[PDB]
Structures are given as structure tokens and as C-alpha cells.
Design a protein around this ligand. Structure first.
Ligand SMILES: Nc1ncnc2c1ncn2[C@@H]1O[C@H](COP(=O)(O)OP(=O)(O)NP(=O)(O)O)[C@@H](O)[C@H]1O
Ligand SMILES: Nc1ncnc2c1ncn2[C@@H]1O[C@H](COP(=O)(O)OP(=O)(O)NP(=O)(O)O)[C@@H](O)[C@H]1O
Ligand SMILES: [Mg+2]
Ligand SMILES: [Mg+2]
Lengths: 47, 49, 385, 394, 253, 79, 71, 129
């Protein structure tokens, strides 16, 4: 992704994570209330 | 020949007496001009009381 | 009871909500700077930079120049450069200077100083009125002079007489003078500044009058107002060093208070209350008599006064209710309410020695005799002839 | 990344993006970069603009036929807007045409004779610098004496910056010949020249020409090390490396270490570590155990050459031992020692799969965080752009 | 190899001229802090980049650079004259049986001192609230001094002798207000027994007079024990006074 | 009773949090004057800043001598 | 052997700094074993490096002390 | 004309924020009178960071928070508020504020006349103001 693609991605999550909890919580509650590193390459053929 | 000045800069400096300024003219508690960088008795000043 | 709970439930939906709103609103989509800030910011930095020397503003000359003093000893004929307008500045304020070239780059400090901290009190005092028991009449004299003109000047106008201004509280330790002042002020709900006199006097030269002038400025803005200057008696005619000095700095601070008392603005709507031993401790000079008007001589508690004051104290000592309020009064020798404070302390002191597990009727009675005995012992028999 | 973080008006930044990208798209023509980074491109000035035209030739390496064609508007005659374009295209041609055809050498040879007078005009100094690197590249291993003579005339003119380019260019053309007449003239001239860039150029050229020259460079090595100039000693050090390449020699190795300990100057100490990596290129096993000591050296320069030497030795298959020495160096405060460690690291693990080795992952993500920090110097980020560019280039 | 680095490195550190020491008075809304540089005047000067304004608190003593005065590191231990005084005085080793006899006084003193510190709640419950202090007086040579130090061992607090006027101190600022400032320093350095020895025989003329700036500085300290009530509510600062005679002592006591 | 008794304990932790977050509001933003029609002032300000005619020390004449003896406020004497 | 000569020369350098000219100050209290705070003759409070291998047993009791002038 | 649609959207939203608090504290429990007073001041600040424009609309309704809710305290807290709202744009905030301020006059309203006339003297920014 390199540095550019990362920076957008990261800020992008952060907005949505805060924004979900900031509204989802208040509505919902009252809705209701009322390895083989060493593993070489498998000996199987591959194309 | 030698002069003890107590400056208005609040420092005390033992300076070679300038030979141009006479030993006679000078006396204890004469008011005097003094060069601003290097401290030497530059000239003499009318005294103030 | 129930009502308290209600307030807690409301807080737990208010603060939780608030925290989250802030994050989303200030930044994210909306943006915290939203372009305009970014512009101001770039300019501000240029003009500035660290360090920045805090200053004191002596006078403004309308011509975009000012006369300032810094930490360093010589004064400066400086230029005002942008930011705070001349109007929005007040002389006597602490101001922001840029260090390389000293120009007024703003203000944010506003007499950032512990003195300001102590003086300001925007709410009304902790003491509500005639919780204090006895000297009723006395406290209903301080109310005639202070409180009554702020609440209604109408009555004074109609008589054809200036409202009284000022009271001077004087007399004796033990009468809870200081307390009465707080009491009267609370009813008024006057903005009640309060200061210790010891702060206004200090060794350093010329800081004293700055501070003193400021008290008077703050008070007039927030009129109707009471200024309570506590321990004016401190300053007195104490003179640090009797070789020389104490006849320079001290004298200058006293002067300033008086010059502003009547002032260049009419502050008849600023009452003053001075708590003091006597005016004879001070060099007398309290200017304008009718401008300090009525003076209040505290008598010490008498027989009826100390009943009420007693009643508070005995409720703290466990099981002293057994001994009738009246008969406690009778059996002891006439004494001041202060000496009740000494007596009440004596009861607990005796309970501690005994390892009296719970305070009893027997302790409170024993307490009287030892307390009375202390006072007689301390007295010196010179023999009435 | 390049456009967003790294600023194009600032020259040092622009060089780092141009070099990293040149490699990214290398070995096939690409105009994708020009288009994407077009506003960015207009910002360029001075030597940032020379590098901007020469970048094109790194990209356009291979596809030989269409190599000349794309460079057509930038050549002199067809360009005289900017001398940095005129000059950096000729360097640019020589990249494509490195070691390939001799039809190209011919063209460049004409341009040298035209300007071997006064390089005193301002345009001419820049032009002729690129021409001189250019023709050396194009003629690599030809052993064309015609080329060599042409770049002598630039030297003797004592052209300000083109003197260096010319001196290098001789040794690249006549690569590994050890022609003695060439050796004699260079060595002697380097004393006369008082200006250091020209001097550095000739020191390093003396080493190039004695490539694989073995024990017949022995005459040269004694003089250069004994030369009182630090400059000739610096190039002395790489004489040994290039001649005595491949098979470790015990003589060669003792000599290199001895010089590094004894000879106080700081460039010179640097030259011996980089130099050792050449002699022991195919026997890089015991190499970290040697250079273990040399990491700890106070000198900032010695730590730099330590980072690179390891790079160079194990530039092939990845070796885990080297990665360990190189981790402290990355976090050493001196800026360029940081830059060295990053470059060195990506060479070792060239084109190893990230899944195959977990370490590959962590190392990239460190380069990206550096650029994100503005707290890390101009240089440190310069290092980082370039280094990533190696990892996934072409 | 490692040793030579260290020697060289120290040399490189020393190079930096100055380097100072202030105290953060407050935090301001542009992300700067108002520092009182302790010998010099006040300066408003930014935080270091590394530490945020949330970390800092009011009255945090800080170190400072001198080439920009930007803050260096927070001081691990508060710079105050009081600290040094403790060092010298040392941990009490004296105990009750060092002094035999005067038996009455020995028993008695445990009640007055030991309990308000260890059990403030118990001392209050049986009795009421807590003292304003204790004044020791009697024949010189009683060994009143030896008694104060003995109790202090068992209490286990920092017994800081401050003998005399603090006009003797002249390290920074005037020594006058350092008297007053005692409250502040005792609070920070609790648990503390401030053993204020001062006979108050500096002049009978000012004991009986209205004159006397020594009397004024003394007075401002006494008031702090009853305005701030830092020592009273959470007792761990005992204000132990000692005068040779009860009758040469200032009458505000 | 008991479900709201334990809210009292909870609230205070939350009040604490609001107090530290105050500083967060205030940010790095200017709270100083310098906007509105006085933002026009700062472009000009820059140019006047480079100009050197200020600060100047305040001194005062103590004797006119047919030059002048000034006495500075640091107590330094100069003709 | 090469590093022995550097080491030796490294100590010599520190001796020049240690040498005259010097200025007297007064060591106050520690802030830390190896960094302390001092007051000069000029009333200025300097937070200063405690150079390696120096007195410690007595250094911490307020005691008179020397400070290199330029450092 | 297209414009009108946006503008409305905003202005009502601003008003409704303040209204829901007003409907709560006044109709329901006296406990909430203190909770909404404590919440209100921190809520101006949020809106000020988020919009310059949002601040001005909220300020007017804010002085009306006082009169409609009927706070416990008609003495101290309005006066404090009003000092701040001299600096800010709008002075229609003052007209709503005053109907709460009436109290037992020449205490609160002795302060009032003293404040307004001083600040008008202070900076004549507008005749309208
Ligand atoms: N009517 C009264 N008001 C208040 N306290 C009173 C009254 N009458 C008696 N007292 C007693 O006086 C005590 C407090 O007085 P105190 O605060 O020591 O004095 P002061 O007159 O302000 N003196 P100073 O110690 O010089 O500031 C109360 O706790 C009571 O025991
Ligand atoms: N009870 C004791 N037993 C033995 N020696 C004692 C005793 N009390 C005092 N001394 C000695 O007498 C000396 C003088 O007494 P000192 O310690 O000055 O007492 P103090 O009563 O606290 N004085 P002051 O504070 O001047 O009124 C001590 O240094 C001891 O050597
Ligand atoms: Mg009192
Ligand atoms: Mg003693």
C-alpha cells in the first residue's frame, strides 16, 4: 500500500469507529428498553 | 603609574594609567570619562555632587 | 434522598454522551481548523517566537506605542504590533512580548499571579446568615450600612441623604468578627472579594501599588460589590528594619489604596469592610469619616449570647445532651464564647486521657471545673486593696 | 507517497523520489510517473532538474531502439530552454546504452570535442558534465582510446565540475585494462589540481582501470597509500578492492584493516570497510564477525561504511547474521548512519517474499513510519524513499 | 572499547553552557506553559515536544535548557532548601529511655504527638478535632530537646529541625518570605515534624512594641495554619515550637 | 436504591476524565486576538517587524552640559 | 593497542576542562545520583552534570564546590 | 431559493437542541434543572469548535434556556453569563436573558444597568448593538 495508502486507510477507520459508538449505543439501548517457515514447498507438483 | 577606577558599570578595574592624561590633573575622586570597550581613562569630566 | 439519585442518573447519560460528541464534532469531517485558523496561525508564528518575555504594561500612548517594564531593569519604548487592539488592552495588565523585538504580540495572561487567585471569589460565602447565634443586634447594624443601600437606594434618596458607605469592624479577638462580615455579605449576595493584607506588602519595590490599584478596579466593574480587606492591621506601623527603610515601600502601598478609595471614578457603590484590632495600630489616615461612616465596637459575649454558641459545641460532644442546656450556662462563671471553644476542647482532651470510650455526662461536668481553674491560674494576683 | 509527503520545491527531497522511482519502473519505459507527478515536476530547479532528465534514462533502460526516440526533444539542438535538460539527457542516454552499442559512443564523442574549450560560460559547465559521464557508460569495456583522449582535453581545461565527470568517465570506458600510460598521466595530474572534486575523480578512476588487474596493481597501491593527500589515500583503498576482488586474499585483507586502524582521517577509514566487502564478496560468512568490532567505533563515518559493506557482500541471498549488526545502526542517532542501514537492509533481502520471511514485513513498515515522522531529518527520509525503491523495483 | 566511549561522551555533554530549572505555574491554550525561572523573572516558554501538556501539572518543578529555555526533563525530586536540611539532621535514634525521669512529661507527650498522625480518626472520636500545635517550655538543661527527638523516632516521620530565622538563608530570593513559604514545603515533604526552634529573643522592644518586620513574617506563617488547613485536616505536619520561656514569646501565640 | 447508589461512585471517575479533556478542547489553537479586521493588520505587521527603530531604551537627562549626562535605569552613566 | 592510545588521549582532554580557569559555586542537593543541582556565587541555579568517578560520599551534603566556567 | 433549504435545515436544528432541554427541565423533575444548566455551558463550547456559524444561533437560545427552564438562581449565574456574551456577536441574547434576570430588582438589575452602559461606552461597534 506504501505510506500514502496507509495514511488514508488509518484515518478512515478511526472516523467510523468513533462515529458508530457515538450513536449506535444510545439508539439501540432505548430501542428495546421501552509457520512452517522451515516448510519448504510441499513436495506436491504445482503448475 | 596606575589608576583604580570604580566604574558606573558596577565593576572594579585596575587600569594602566594613560600617559597622555597627566598624573597632576588626575587626583583621588576625580570624575572621568573612560573608553567603553577596553577600560582606560580617556578624558576628564566636570565633577558633580 | 430520592431526588439525589435522579441527579446521578442524569449525569451518567450527560457526561458519557458529551465525550463522544466532542471527538466527532471538533475534528473528523468538520475539521478543527477549517482553513480560517490555518491562516491566522501562519501569521502568528512569524510575529512570535519562543521564548516570549512576559511583561507589565505601564501606560498606553495612542500612537501605537506603549511604555513597558520587563523582568530586565530598564523600560522600553516599544511598539504595539498588531493583535490586541488598544481598547481591548487595560493598562496594569500582564502582557505577551516577543523576545527578539519587544512588541505587544497579545494578551492571555491577565495578572497571572497568586494574588489574583486569592482575591477573586465570584460566588457568595460559605456562611449563610444568623446561623451564627447571638450578637443579633450587632449584626443588624452592619446590615443597615452595607446591605441596605445596595438592595434599595430608594429610601436614602427620598430622605435627601447620601447612603452610608463603609463600616470598620474593630475590637477584640474571640467575637468572631471575621465571620460576621462573611454572613452579612452572603445575604446581599454581593460579589464579595476577599484579600489578606500581608500580600499587598512585600520587600520588592513598586509591585505593591500595582496590586493595590487593581483591587479597586476589579471591584468597581463588578459593582454592587463588597471589598473585605482582612488583616489591614498587619501592615500597621511595622517597619522592617529601624535603621532605615520601611518608610519607603510600605508608605507607597498605603497611599494608593487611599488615592483610589474615593478615586477618579465615583465608587460609592463599593462598600468596604475593614477588620482590624484598632485604627491606632495603623498610622491613622482613613480618609473621609462619613465615607467610612458607622464604626462597630464588638462587645464580647454576655450571658444570653453564649447560650446559643454553646448549643452548637455540646452537640459535637457525644452524650452531653443529658446535662440540660440551661444548667450548663448557670454553673460556670461568665465567660466569652471563645472560652467555650477552650472548654469544649477540654472535654475531649480529658476523654482522651481517661480512654473514655464514649463521651459522657460525667466528662462534660468535669470539663467545666478544669477549664475555669486554667483561666484563674493564668491570672496574677496583684491583690485588690 | 512521493507527491504527498515529500516536497518537490526542496531539492534534496526531489532527488530521493527521482532515484527511488527510477528504479521502480526500471528496465521498461514508463511515462506513468511524469503524468502522475506533473505539477510536482514543474517545481524543480537547479540540479533537481538535471536529475529529473537523467531519471528518465534509468527508467528507460532496455528497449534500446526506443531509447533514443524518447530522448529526442531533450537533446541539444532540440532544447536550449534549460541547460540542465540538455546536459542530463546525455547522461540519460548513456544509462540506456550502458555496455550496449557503439553507434551511441560515436554521437557523444562529437559533443565532447565541441565544448573542450572554455567551460567558463555557465550553460557549458553543466552540459559537459553529463556528456562526460554519459560517454564513459556508453563505452563500457570497449577500451576505445578515442574516448579517453577526448576526456583528457576536458581535464586540462580544468573545467569546474566537469573535471570530475571526465576523470570518472575515462576509467569506466577503459575498464580493467591497466594501461600504464593512462595510470601515469592520471596519478601525476592529481597532485597539480588543487580543487578536490577533480582530484577525487582521478583517484577513483585509477582504481576502475585496474579492475581485475591483480598483483600488477601493486605498483600503484604503494604510491597512493604513501601519498600525503587524504584524497589519494581514499582512492588507494578501492584500488586494492577492485584488483583483488572475489577470492579472498590474505595479503589484501591485512592491508585493508591495517590502513583503517592506522590512518586517522575519516573518509579514508570509511573507504577501507566498503572496500573489504568486495574482496570477500563470495565468502561473506565470517564477514559480520569482523565488522562486529567496527560498528562500535565512535566514528560516524566508520559506522556508515560498515552498514554499506554488509549490504554489498550479501547483496544476493539473504543472510540472517548481517541483519543483526544492522539493527542498532538504524537506531544510531547520526542521521546518515540511519540512511545507510535502511539501504543496506533492502539489498540483503532483495525480492524475498514477505510471507516466506516475517522479518521482511517489519523492515518495510519501519521505512514508511520514518517518512511519516517529520521529526526524522531530511536525510533520514531521503534514505527511506530510496531504500523501499530497491525492495520492489522494476 | 566501551570505556573510551564513555570518557568521550561525558566531555561532549559538558559542552552545553548554562542549563536551568523553573516551575510550571499554569498551562495555556496555545500549548505553552508559564514557567517561573527560579533566579530570573517569569517567562512564558513552550513545553518540550516529547511531553504533552496533559502530563504536566500545576507547580511541577522542571529543568530547563538555556539556549532556548525549552523544558528538558521534570525534576525527580523537588528543589527546596528543606530537603537539604533533613539530610544533615538525620533519622532520630534517640528513644525515651535516653532520658530517665521527668516521668510525667514522658507519658503525656505520647498522647499529644503520636496519635494525631497515626490515627487522626481515633484522636478526633474520643476527643474532638486536632491541635494547632504544641509549645514546649521549661528550665534549659531539662533536655526538652532530647524529648522532642525521642518521640520523633517512634512516630517515624521526617524530623526537620529548622532553627531560627530563615533570613540566614539567602540562596535564592530574600529570606523573608521563605519563612512564610515553609507551609508549602512542609506539605510536599510530608510526613514531617517541623521543629520550629526560635526563642524570640531578637528584641524585647518589638515583643512589647508595634514595630518589627520579623514579627510580621512570623505572623503570616501562623495564619497559613488556619486559612489553608492543609496540615489540620490530614494531619502529618506537626507544628512543634520551642521557646525557653512562655513569657518572652510573641503574643500572637 | 442499590442500582443508583453505585452510580455515585461511577460519576466521579467520569468528572475526572472531563477535567483532563479540558486541555484537549483548548488544543494548540490561538485564543489570542488577531482575527476579523485585525487580520488585515498582520500582513503589514510583518514588514514593520523587520524595521529596527524599536525597542529603544528609555533614558532621561540628569544634567544638560554645554551632550548630556544620561542616567539609565540599570544605573549606568553615559555622556 | 590502537584503542589504548585513544583512551589515554581522551582522558588528557578532560584534564584541560578540569583545570583553571574555574569558578566557585556550592553543591546543594541531588536530583538523582549522577545529576545534581548547584547554586553559583552569582545566584544562578544550574542543573549540572556530575562527571564520572567523583566524590559522592560527601558531595550530597550541602558543600562547597567548583564549576568549570565555560561548561 | 435553493439556498433557503439548507439554511433552514441548520437554523431549526440549532434551536431544537436547546428546546428539548427546556421541555425536560421545566416539565419534569427539579433535579434536571441543575443537570441541564451544567450541561449547557460545555455544549456551547463544543458547537463553537465545530462551527463559527453554529455558535451565534445557539447563544441566543442559551439566554432563553434560563427564562424557560426557570433555574433556581436568578442572582449570580446570569450575570456571569452576560459578561461573556458582550464580546460575542448578537445582543438579542440580552433581551431573552433579562426576563429571567428580573428577580428582586436593584441587586441583579443594579448590576445590569451598570454592565450594559459601560460596554456600550466601551466600544461603539454598532448603533444597532
Ligand atoms: N456571635 C458570634 N459569632 C461568631 N463566633 C462567635 C460569636 N460569639 C462568640 N463566638 C465564638 O468565637 C469563635 C471564633 O472566633 P475567632 O474566629 O477566634 O475570632 P476574631 O474575632 O475573628 N479574631 P482573630 O483570631 O484576631 O482573627 C467561635 O467559634 C465562637 O466560639
Ligand atoms: N535529663 C537529662 N539527663 C542528662 N543530661 C541532660 C538531661 N537534660 C539535659 N542534659 C544535658 O544538658 C545539656 C543542655 O541541655 P539542652 O539539651 O540544651 O536542653 P533544653 O532544656 O532543650 N534547652 P533550651 O532549648 O536552651 O531552653 C544537654 O546537651 C545534655 O548534655
Ligand atoms: Mg478574625
Ligand atoms: Mg532545647
Amino acid at each position: 500500500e506504501e505510506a500514502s495508502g496507509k495514511e488514508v486507510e488509518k484515518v478512515a477507520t478511526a472516523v467510523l469507529s468513533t462515529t458508530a459508538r457515538a450513536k449506535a449505543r444510545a439508539k439501540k439501548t432505548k430501542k428495546e428498553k421501552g509457520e512452517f517457515y522451515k516448510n519448504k514447498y510441499s513436495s506436491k507438483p504445482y503448475k | 603609574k596606575a589608576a583604580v577606577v570604580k566604574t558606573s558599570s558596577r565593576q572594579t578595574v585596575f587600569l594602566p594609567m594613560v600617559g597622555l592624561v597627566d598624573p597632576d590633573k588626575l587626583k583621588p575622586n576625580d570624575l572621568v570619562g573612560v573608553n567603553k570597550d577596553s577600560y582606560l581613562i580617556l578624558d576628564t569630566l566636570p565633577s558633580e555632587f | 434522598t430520592r431526588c439525589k439519585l435522579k441527579l446521578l442518573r442524569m449525569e451518567r447519560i450527560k457526561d458519557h454522551l458529551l465525550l463522544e460528541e466532542e471527538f466527532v464534532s471538533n475534528s473528523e469531517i468538520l475539521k478543527p481548523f477549517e482553513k480560517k485558523q490555518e491562516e491566522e496561525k501562519k501569521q502568528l508564528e512569524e510575529i512570535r517566537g519562543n521564548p516570549l518575555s512576559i511583561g507589565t504594561l505601564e501606560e498606553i500612548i495612542d500612537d501605537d506605542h506603549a511604555i513597558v517594564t520587563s523582568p530586565t531593569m530598564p523600560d522600553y519604548y516599544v511598539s504595539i504590533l498588531s493583535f490586541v487592539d488598544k481598547e481591548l488592552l487595560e493598562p496594569g495588565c500582564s502582557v505577551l512580548l516577543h523576545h527578539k523585538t519587544m512588541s505587544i504580540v497579545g494578551v492571555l495572561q491577565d495578572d497571572a499571579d497568586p494574588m489574583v487567585s486569592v482575591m477573586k471569589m465570584d460566588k457568595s460565602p460559605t456562611e449563610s446568615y444568623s446561623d451564627i447565634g447571638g450578637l443579633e443586634s450587632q449584626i443588624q447594624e452592619i446590615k443597615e450600612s452595607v446591605e441596605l443601600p445596595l438592595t434599595h437606594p430608594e429610601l436614602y434618596e427620598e430622605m435627601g441623604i447620601k447612603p452610608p458607605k463603609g463600616v470598620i469592624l474593630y475590637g477584640a479577638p474571640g467575637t468572631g468578627k471575621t465571620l460576621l462580615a462573611k454572613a452579612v455579605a452572603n445575604q446581599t449576595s454581593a460579589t464579595f472579594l476577599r484579600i489578606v493584607g500581608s500580600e499587598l506588602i512585600q520587600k520588592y519595590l513598586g509591585d505593591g501599588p500595582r496590586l493595590c490599584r487593581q483591587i479597586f478596579k476589579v471591584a468597581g466593574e463588578n459593582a454592587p460589590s463588597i471589598v473585605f480587606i482582612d488583616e489591614i492591621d498587619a501592615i500597621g506601623t511595622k517597619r522592617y528594619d529601624s535603621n532605615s527603610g520601611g518608610e519607603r515601600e510600605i508608605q507607597r502601598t498605603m497611599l494608593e489604596l487611599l488615592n483610589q478609595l474615593d478615586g477618579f471614578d465615583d465608587r460609592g457603590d463599593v462598600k468596604v469592610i475593614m477588620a482590624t484590632n484598632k485604627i491606632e495600630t495603623l498610622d491613622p489616615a482613613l480618609i473621609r469619616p462619613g465615607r467610612i461612616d458607622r464604626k462597630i465596637l464588638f462587645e464580647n459575649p454576655d450571658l444570653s449570647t453564649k447560650k446559643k454558641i454553646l448549643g452548637i459545641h455540646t452537640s459535637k460532644m457525644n452524650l452531653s445532651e443529658d446535662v440540660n442546656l440551661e444548667t450548663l450556662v448557670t454553673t460556670k462563671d461568665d465567660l466569652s464564647g471563645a472560652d467555650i471553644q477552650a472548654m469544649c476542647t477540654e472535654a475531649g482532651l480529658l476523654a482522651l486521657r481517661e480512654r473514655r470510650m464514649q463521651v459522657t455526662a460525667e466528662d462534660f461536668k468535669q470539663a467545666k471545673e478544669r477549664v475555669m481553674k486554667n483561666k484563674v491560674e493564668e491570672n496574677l494576683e496583684g491583690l485588690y486593696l | 507517497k512521493s507527491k504527498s509527503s515529500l516536497d518537490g520545491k526542496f531539492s534534496l527531497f526531489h532527488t530521493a523520489v527521482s532515484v527511488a522511482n527510477g528504479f521502480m519502473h526500471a528496465g521498461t519505459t514508463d511515462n506513468s510517473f511524469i503524468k502522475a507527478n506533473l505539477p510536482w515536476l514543474g517545481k524543480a530547479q537547479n540540479w533537481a532538474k538535471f536529475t529529473a532528465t537523467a531519471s528518465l534514462g534509468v527508467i528507460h533502460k532496455g528497449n534500446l531502439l526506443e531509447g533514443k526516440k524518447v530522448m529526442a526533444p531533450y537533446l541539444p539542438g532540440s532544447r536550449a530552454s534549460s541547460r540542465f535538460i540538455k546536459g542530463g539527457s546525455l547522461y540519460g542516454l548513456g544509462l540506456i546504452y550502458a555496455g550496449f552499442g557503439r553507434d551511441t559512443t560515436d554521437y557523444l564523442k562529437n559533443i565532447i570535442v565541441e565544448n573542450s574549450g572554455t567551460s567558463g560560460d555557465e550553460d557549458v559547465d553543466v552540459l559537459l558534465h553529463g556528456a562526460s559521464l554519459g560517454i564513459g557508460l556508453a563505452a563500457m569495456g570497449s577500451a576505445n582510446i578515442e574516448v579517453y583522449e577526448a576526456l583528457k582535453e576536458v581535464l586540462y581545461n580544468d573545467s569546474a565540475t566537469s573535471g570530475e565527470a571526465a576523470a570518472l568517465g575515462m576509467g569506466l570506458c577503459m575498464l580493467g585494462t591497466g594501461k600504464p600510460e593512462a595510470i601515469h598521466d592520471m596519478f601525476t595530474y592529481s597532485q597539480e589540481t588543487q580543487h578536490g572534486n577533480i582530484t577525487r575523480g582521478l583517484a577513483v578512476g585509477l582504481a576502475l582501470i585496474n579492475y581485475g588487474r591483480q598483483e600488477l596493481a601493486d605498483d600503484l597501491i604503494t604510491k597512493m597509500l604513501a601519498s600525503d593527500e587524504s584524497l589519494l589515500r581514499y582512492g588507494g583503498a578501492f584500488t586494492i578492492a577492485l584488483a583483488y576482488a572475489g577470492t579472498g586474499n590474505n595479503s589484501a585483507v591485512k592491508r585493508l584493516l591495517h590502513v583503517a586502524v592506522s590512518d586517522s582521517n575519516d573518509d579514508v577509514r570509511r573507504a577501507a570497510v566498503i572496500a573489504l566487502g568486495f574482496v570477500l564478496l563470495r565468502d561473506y560468512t565470517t564477514v559480520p564477525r569482523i565488522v562486529q568490532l567496527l560498528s562500535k567505533s565512535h566514528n560516524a563515518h566508520v559506522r556508515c561504511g560498515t552498514a554499506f559493506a554488509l549490504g554489498i557482500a550479501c547483496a544476493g541471498k539473504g543472510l540472517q547474521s548481517a541483519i543483526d549488526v544492522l539493527d542498532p545502526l538504524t537506531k544510531d542517532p547520526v542521521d546518515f548512519v540511519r540512511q545507510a542501514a535502511m539501504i543496506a537492509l533492502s539489498m540483503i533481502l532483495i525480492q524475498q517474499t514477505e510471507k516466506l520471511n516475517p522479518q521482511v514485513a517489519d523492515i518495510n513498515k519501519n521505512f514508511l513510519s520514518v517518512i511519516t515522522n517529520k521529526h526524522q531529518e531530511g536525510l533520514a527520509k531521503f534514505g527511506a524513499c530510496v531504500a523501499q525503491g530497491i525492495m520492489n523495483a522494476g | 572499547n566501551d570505556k573510551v566511549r564513555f570518557i568521550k561522551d561525558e566531555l561532549r555533554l559538558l559542552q552545553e553552557p548554562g542549563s536551568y530549572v523553573g516551575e510550571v505555574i499554569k498551562i495555556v491554550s496555545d500549548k505553552k506553559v508559564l514557567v517561573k525561572v527560579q533566579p530570573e523573572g517569569k517567562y512564558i516558554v513552550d513545553v518540550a515536544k516529547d511531553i504533552n501538556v496533559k502530563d504536566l501539572k500545576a507547580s511541577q518543578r522542571v529543568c530547563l535548557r538555556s539556549d532556548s529555555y525549552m523544558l528538558h526533563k521534570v525534576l525527580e525530586n523537588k528543589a527546596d532548601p528543606l530537603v537539604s536540611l533533613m539530610m544533615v539532621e538525620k533519622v532520630p535514634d534517640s528513644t525515651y529511655d535516653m532520658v530517665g525521669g521527668l516521668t510525667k512529661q514522658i507519658k503525656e507527650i505520647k498522647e499529644v504527638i503520636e496519635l494525631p498522625v497515626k490515627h487522626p480518626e481515633l484522636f478526633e472520636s474520643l476527643g474532638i478535632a486536632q491541635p494547632k500545635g504544641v509549645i514546649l517550655y521549661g528550665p534549659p538543661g531539662t533536655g526538652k530537646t532530647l524529648l522532642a527527638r525521642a518521640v520523633a523516632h517512634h512516630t517515624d516521620c521526617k524530623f526537620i529541625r529548622v532553627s531560627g530565622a530563615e533570613l540566614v538563608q539567602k540562596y535564592i530570593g530574600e529570606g523573608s518570605r521563605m519563612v512564610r513559604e515553609l507551609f508549602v514545603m512542609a506539605r510536599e515533604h510530608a510526613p514531617s515534624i517541623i521543629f520550629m526552634d526560635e526563642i524570640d529573643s531578637i528584641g524585647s522592644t518589638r515583643v512589647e512594641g508595634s514595630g518589627g518586620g520579623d514579627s510580621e513574617v512570623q505572623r503570616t506563617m501562623l495564619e497559613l495554619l488556619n486559612q489553608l488547613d492543609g496540615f489540620e485536616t490530614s494531619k502529618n505536619i506537626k507544628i512543634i515550637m520551642a521557646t525557653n520561656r512562655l513569657d518572652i514569646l510573641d503574643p500572637a501565640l | 436504591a442499590a442500582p443508583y447508589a453505585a452510580k455515585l461512585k461511577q460519576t466521579e471517575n467520569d468528572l475526572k476524565d472531563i477535567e483532563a479533556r479540558i486541555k484537549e478542547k483548548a488544543g494548540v489553537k490561538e485564543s489570542d486576538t488577531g482575527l476579523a479586521p485585525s487580520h488585515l493588520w498582520d500582513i503589514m505587521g510583518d514588514r514593520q517587524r523587520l524595521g529596527e527603530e524599536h525597542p529603544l531604551q528609555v533614558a532621561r537627562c540628569t544634567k544638560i552640559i554645554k551632550k548630556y549626562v544620561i542616567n539609565l535605569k540599570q544605573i549606568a552613566k553615559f555622556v | 593497542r590502537h584503542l589504548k592510545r585513544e583512551l589515554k588521549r581522551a582522558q588528557e582532554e578532560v584534564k584541560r576542562i578540569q583545570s583553571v580557569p574555574l569558578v566557585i559555586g556550592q553543591f546543594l542537593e541531588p536530583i538523582d545520583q549522577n545529576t545534581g543541582i548547584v547554586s553559583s556565587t552569582t545566584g544562578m541555579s544550574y542543573v549540572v552534570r556530575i562527571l564520572s568517578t567523583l566524590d559522592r560520599e560527601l558531595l550530597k551534603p550541602s558543600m562547597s564546590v567548583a564549576l568549570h566556567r565555560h561548561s | 431559493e435553493i439556498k433557503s433549504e439548507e439554511k433552514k435545515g441548520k437554523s431549526s436544528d440549532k434551536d431544537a437542541t436547546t428546546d428539548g432541554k427546556n421541555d425536560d427541565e421545566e416539565e419534569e423533575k427539579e433535579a434536571g434543572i441543575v443537570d441541564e444548566l451544567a450541561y449547557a455551558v460545555l455544549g456551547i463550547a463544543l458547537i463553537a469548535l465545530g462551527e463559527d456559524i453554529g455558535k451565534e444561533m445557539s447563544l441566543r437560545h442559551f439566554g432563553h434556556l434560563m427564562h424557560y427552564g426557570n433555574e433556581h438562581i436568578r442572582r449570580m449565574v446570569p450575570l456571569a453569563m452576560g459578561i461573556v456574551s458582550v464580546s460575542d456577536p448578537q445582543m438579542k441574547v440580552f433581551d431573552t436573558l433579562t426576563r429571567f434576570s428580573h428577580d428582586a430588582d436593584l441587586e441583579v438589575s443594579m448590576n445590569s444597568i451598570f454592565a450594559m452602559g459601560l460596554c456600550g461606552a466601551g466600544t461603539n461597534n454598532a448603533r444597532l448593538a
